[PDB]
């Protein structure tokens, strides 16, 4: 949960 | 996975 993947933005879920 | 809360930099575990 940040930034990354995963949750946050970037890759996966959420943004980016 | 990356930075934040979880794996990575940060909190959780990793380094931080």
Same mark, same amino acid.
């Given at each position: 949960?940040? *930034?990354? *993947?995963?949750?946050? !933005?970037?890759?996966?879920?959420? !943004?980016?």
């Amino acid at each position: 949960v940040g *930034a990354x *993947a995963x949750v946050x !933005w970037x890759w996966x879920w959420x !943004w980016x």
